[PDB]
Amino acid sequence: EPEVTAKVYFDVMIDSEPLGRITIGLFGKDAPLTTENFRQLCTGEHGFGYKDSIFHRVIQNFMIQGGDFTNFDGTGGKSIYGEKFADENLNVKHFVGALSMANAGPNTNGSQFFITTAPTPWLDGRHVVFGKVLDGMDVVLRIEKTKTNSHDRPVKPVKIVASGEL
């Protein structure tokens, strides 16, 4: 597994009820452009960011998705390098607790990411794994069970009330 260079966090809440904090580690050396994008969206430096956004797609035994802070349905989001950016590294493989980039085909990374809650090998080579949950994995296994409707969207919104850096 890659070396962790930086640490970010998400304080999560499901409809007024605080769940806790997800501390994430970032593989800065194996995917510098990608982790930088992530880091700066966590702080909010450029005006926009993951703060107040939600996890619009949660699927038990698979993953939880988020990062659409411009449409909240999974059709939006934007990187700090404009609209989209090429995939830096596709050599790192997925594992439970990994941070990976969600996309729309090759070289279409934006701001949407997912955290895996089970083995997703069939995804290797197509999504840039750029980090791992260092702590707050139980907070992730909590969200995973929340009630969703068709389209796998959370009935009660799962919100990132605060995101930052350590």
Partner: peptide
Amino acid sequence: XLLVTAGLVLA
């Protein structure tokens, strides 16, 4: 299937 896309979301 089991994909994590941004926009379409298929099988």
